[PDB]
């Protein structure tokens, strides 16, 4: 019955955060300030990766692939041994298995996966596709596995395919894809084609300069991106290209004026440990040597330049980092995780309420059938129909998110990705722009995660085996 | 509003389980079938460990310790470097830090713990006290740290105490405690003193034979215990010592008649991997037969048990009190603390209500405020009352708070429960209230954006 | 004082073998019957691999590499973590470490390698370059590591190099090489360029038809090659292209007539386990359906077609196979290991006797300096000069084999490759043709491997701590 | 012809070692410093194990067993599936197979062993009896298999014996033997009976204090034993019990004065990894002090020893009787069998000579023969004499042959020696005959093409 802001404006709270204590707002650029348009940006990365793979010898049918945003979900595991995409829970239990576009059923999942379980720490065999840049790669791996499996020129093996005399393991194929994505991002034409048509590929919104200017009135604001200065300058200039400043009627000002500290070539995640040598960019040439642009460095250096403490820093961005080093080197930043998928997922939550409602009433009906039964009862009520309907309606709900289900769950089970969100992120939202709807004095209060004995037991007011006498 | 059984009869569901698919019910003995009375049994283990430590050289003031059930909560981490008991969350963030009986404030925690965080994988430094047998040792560690800290004969250091020329690190003190507890269980008088006063130390309840007999009508039932046969026979004979069988009026039956397979000397968790040689016990002498109904096994493996029972993993519901790692039986986890924690949940409702009211008031004070707002409403009072009422709530569980949470955050132990257990309850005896055709359906653990958004725009968010 | 055949004719005996019991002589083709000319064949494989790598984006300086037979030795370990070539002993102790062409000294070896030791079973990090086809690949890995390390366009890291924005790990580079060698052998122009100039690339000798015909008079003879029929037919026709048959004056006969059983597409090593489906080749088209050519199959099938027992079979070839399956499925063949390097190594053994002799007399001099000393003595004779001379003369000897030393040893220590020879091979020689110099009744008697307490104690005729009373 | 010390004083060299670089000499105690008398000590361990097995139910005819030193050779593999003792080479090829006391011929070996080969990595099936303590158990396994095979009360099966209703697998019989040996060493009377008649069971020799005192003049000396302090004190006091010190005329000194560091309760091999907490012993009570020259340590790690000694790995020569795996100290391996094996090598020379003559004659009979030859000379006689004389040679070592070889092939144990040991000898006491400036230079292990080709063509071989 408490007041809550409209859902699509909310910032969600994993751990409590008193915003009045925040003195510095730090930002990633890609997919945080620079939100890339979907599906256009993924298709561009898809198309460039396919072209690079064809350029190194992959067959011409790759050019008939077309990126399909309805297939990939972030956080899938590619098993390089069997060429499968796996959606797993926090502990490695298998929730979904797809070989190419063929979704593997419960029983035959066991043939390849004993106990429907993988050792997700075996980074030699399993690659976790966690990032927004990974999305085209996820769809591509399925396309290739699908193409080779059904093309007669190839004989399918359990761990790969035979191209004439050549055996190509799925692991070797995966490394070709991984290398080709990297090439496209770092040597290929991806940045050039993005920059030459910013309107098609990058979101633009006047709420961004407005929010960042309000942040700079209460604290310091900094940028730490892995991109180089040239690419950063093009992107940020575009993001702030309006015929006014923070508010309508005010003069436009340069994007740089919004930041107390600008840092490019960050080399994250190494940035958060030792980092690299702190350099400084010549703004004119964009080559190396307020108003200063830094290069490389470390999070510790940034902390000292801004005269701040880790807990005073709210770091806003799209990447999930690991717990490494946080038990030794002090000063850990607070974190805001941008999760774009939340916008569509919140729509499913409200626009598909019919599915959720029926699942609830099916569970209510079940409880009624067993209301009067205990271990003394030999009645075995028929629930096979109810069970079938629950499986079907749960499958419909999953499919409302796409072919690989919700980012956060699969049926009743939370995903590995969801558990990483709850580890990593103090706050999270579809976009950082939702901070616009909260004052900078706000106390963000953590939402409780109830366990079964809490969510199903009212506060409303015995065998000694339970009580230990 | 869906029908649910009375709270104290409930079996709670982490993952869905169709009971009609279960063909074998397996049991641990200790703290599952044989529920040890509390605080009596911990007090006995405490006293025997303290006496064992005195006999190897610890000072006489240990004899003045008395076990105090209100202090320890299961699942605490003992840091052998700094001598602290730590309550931590699923990821290693510190929730509580006690040096002896001194509870440490947030800021001073950071002095020893950068980022209020520990690497729980550092097995050489941190020992996790997860088991019910661990409760006396948990209290004992605090008493010792308290005693030596405040005794003039000793000089407190960061990593231990100086006894003149001698230095006793918390790591060495810990090893003494750990060996002493092992000795009491394996060589000392704990089993003997338990067995010679069963009424004081072990719960007895006629529901147990009743439930086990009903399980045997629908499938197979087995025992797999680490205890030896002599101890097991004594305990099980007591648990089944009634002047009738499963129901009043029926003849009493020996405990062995309730099990299709009885295995002692299991050596769990090794049991769940390679195991050891499958042996058989001479029930008359309690010793192993040289060669291999009526039969008692010893050693073996979980694989061998499945072959003898004609079962597959998913067909087996393994009922017990220990959490195992996952390096495939269904699992029922017995968690006896739940009985008192469910009472706090229903008898201390008014604390919960007030926290919700304070939260509702906070939302009201920021209702009309956004990033353009300059108001900073005074919330210091409200913040102070929230902190005080959350601490009152924690203290309702004991000095180290709830097994499953600290203030708002879930514990490492809670996250282990959610990983390991398909089903859980204060006792397996709650299965008596469910038919064997029951479909247990998982209770969802909601994420913030699910539990705070009803089922009833900037392109930065929608990606256009 | 016993009679021995001339060294370059010898067959060397690891385990005794009564040749009168052998009923079947089996053969590999590549580098056994078809001995490829050196260094020409390696250079061709080198050149094709470099061209394939340049074709997938590697820089143009690769075209200025030239294969150098004096660098690689067979059996080196490529450490994909640090980009080093490692020569190790039977147990993983490091004997030689080269980063590119930079040979790493004793002390700095320890920085990267604790205890001068590697876990050689870690097949994810360490790749063993065991085969004759591997030789060009071994030299290529050193060239590339050398090129990138000293080319200014690249920044060297510990685990790879930076090409602008792109980081290329040595492991990713290794996989590019491994893939490119495979492509060249199985899809590229290697076989075509070999077949179009057989005189330049394949050894030809009339002793081969003569020996195989004498083998067929006492037993059965079979061929089991991984090559396909078309390539096999071209190669074998060339090997038997003389204007006479086994002896001068006799009519020429087709290569096939020398074999009771011919098997192509063997898919070794899988051949020695379950194998593949036994197929039969249409000789005319060379496509699939005495005088019969088989395809695929298994060693067990071959054993049954020839009506033989494993111990009755002497399998002659150039590859070393593992112990897998030999504790379960019975019928293990006897083995003759062709080791071409033996021809040059036997030359060093006799033509460098001067180096061996001085090492011996330096060891004799050492023994004299300590002749009259025991634990009661405090004299510490100066041996620093002797020690320096032993290190230098041992280095000279090693270099007589090439930059990476002998195939079989490094100083006093036997190599991993030598220990695999002594595990795998009953007999071994520079070529199987040395069987020509032995009758088929010969008893091959194993040469003893003396331990130190045997080789340094004469048979020529005490504290109870030693005798246990 | 180079100068070499007398054979029975030699220290043999697997890898070169500059003794002047050695700064610390570390010692095992059992079977290194304390050499147990043979056959007396094995006979005692045998008798105590047999009595322990009888007490748990094994038949009375075990009491008629007598230990026989001429049967067992160290390093044999017990196959718990088929109940065989196997002597194998470095790669798992079978050299010898004994079922009980029945030695199995080549062909019948293939029935049970495809390719005359075992997977020595199959730890669940094969147990390798590598240690000197293992000798009594090796003979005991054969006696038991012999007894049950030939006793009418039992039915021999492939994998064990039937005792009416009972089946005793070799695997279970093996486990009984293994536990019985452990019990005798750790709970039974073996240590007590050793210590109460030291003269019968332990070698004593004045060279030991002499050598150790010379080592301490050039570097540090330490003891690291798995035995406890009470046992160690008794044994070491005996080893140093002479009415003088290192040399005649000098005052006797306590054994502890010979060591810069004394460590008991080492728990090797765990010692070489993480180890346990470094503790200190109260030399008066023999118990651990609660806190931590004159000092005796307990537990700890190899890393901790190196810090206390100010040493690095390569600076340490570790002298002892056990072979450890390599999952960096220099090593001296004590191998007491060498004393008798060196006697066979020099007193049985005439067998060696004759084998060489038969080999020389064979080479003469094939001298003028090549692949064109049709002669098949009769070698069946010569072959038979070779086989007979090689068997006579093997038998000079005992029924299971040499520790290091079988006929012509090297043993698995020999290949472990070459891997693990930089230096080796019958006893470390042979170090007395070498100055501490000595440079030990490896003796080469030659391959066939090296040892049969003096230092004094087809393009198929030369590759053109």
From Swiss-Prot, chains A, C:
Kindly state the tissue distribution recorded for this protein.
Answer: Widely expressed.
| Binding locations of ATP | 120, 130, 420, 423
Q: Name one GO molecular function term.
A: metal ion binding
UniProt: adenosine 2 binding residues:
403
List ligand-binding residues for adenosine 1. 130, 420
Where along this sequence does the record place binding of GMP?
Answer: 28, 30, 178, 182, 191, 225-226, 268
InterPro entries per UniProt: HAD-like_sf, HAD-SF_hydro_IG_5-nucl, HAD_sf, Pur_nucleotidase
The record's similarity note reads: Belongs to the 5'(3')-deoxyribonucleotidase family.
- What is the protein name stated in its UniProt record? Cytosolic purine 5'-nucleotidase
Record organism? Homo sapiens (Human)
Instruction: Kindly list the organism's lineage.
Output: Eukaryota, Metazoa, Chordata, Craniata, Vertebrata
């Amino acid at each position: 019955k408490k007041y809550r802001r409209e859902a699509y404006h909310r910032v969600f709270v994993n751990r409590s955060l008193a915003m009045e204590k925040i003195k510095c707002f730090g930002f990633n650029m890609d997919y945080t300030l620079a939100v890339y348009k979907s599906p256009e940006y993924e298709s561009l990365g898809f198309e460039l990766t396919v072209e690079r793979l064809v350029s190194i010898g992959y067959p011409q049918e790759l050019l008939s692939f077309a990126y399909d945003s309805t297939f990939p979900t972030r956080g899938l595991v590619f098993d390089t041994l069997y060429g499968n995409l796996l959606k797993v829970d926090a502990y490695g239990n298998l929730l979904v298995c797809a070989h190419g576009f063929n979704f593997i059923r419960g029983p035959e999942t066991r043939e390849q996966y004993p106990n429907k379980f993988i050792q997700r720490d075996d980074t030699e065999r399993f690659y976790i596709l966690n990032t927004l840049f990974n999305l085209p790669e996820t769809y591509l791996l399925a396309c290739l596995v699908d193409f080779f499996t059904n093309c007669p020129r190839y004989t399918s093996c359990e761990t790969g395919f035979k191209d004439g005399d050549l055996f190509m393991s799925y692991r070797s194929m995966f490394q070709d894809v991984r290398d080709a994505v990297d090439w496209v991002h770092y040597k290929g034409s991806l940045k050039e084609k993005t920059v030459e048509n910013l309107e098609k590929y990058v979101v633009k919104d006047g709420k961004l300069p407005l929010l960042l200017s309000r942040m700079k009135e209460v604290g310091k604001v900094f940028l730490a991106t892995n991109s180089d200065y040239k690419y950063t300058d093009k992107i940020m200039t575009y993001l702030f290209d309006f015929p006014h400043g923070p508010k309508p009627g005010s003069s436009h000002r340069p994007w740089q004026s919004y930041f107390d500290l600008i840092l490019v070539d960050a080399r994250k995640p190494l940035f958060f440990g030792e980092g690299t040598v702190l350099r400084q960019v010549d703004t004119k040439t964009g080559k190396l040597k307020h108003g200063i642009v830094y290069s490389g460095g470390s999070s510790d250096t940034i902390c000292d330049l801004l005269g701040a403490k880790g807990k005073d820093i709210l770091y806003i961005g799209d990447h999930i980092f690991g717990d490494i080093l946080k038990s030794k080197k002090r000063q850990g930043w607070r974190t805001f995780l941008v999760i774009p998928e939340l916008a569509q997922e919140l729509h499913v939550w409200t626009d598909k309420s019919s599915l959720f409602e029926e699942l609830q009433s099916l569970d209510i009906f079940l409880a009624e059938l067993y209301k009067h039964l205990d271990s003394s009862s030999n009645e075995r009520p028929d629930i096979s129909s109810i069970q079938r309907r629950i499986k079907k309606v749960t499958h419909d709900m999953d499919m409302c998110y796409g072919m690989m289900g919700s980012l956060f769950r699969s049926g009743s089970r939370q995903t590995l990705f969801a558990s990483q969100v709850m580890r990593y992120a103090d706050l999270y939202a579809a976009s950082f722009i939702n901070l616009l709807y909260y004052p900078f004095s706000y106390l963000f209060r953590a939402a409780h995660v109830l366990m079964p004995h809490e969510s199903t037991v009212e506060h409303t007011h015995e065998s000694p085996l339970a009580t230990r006498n």
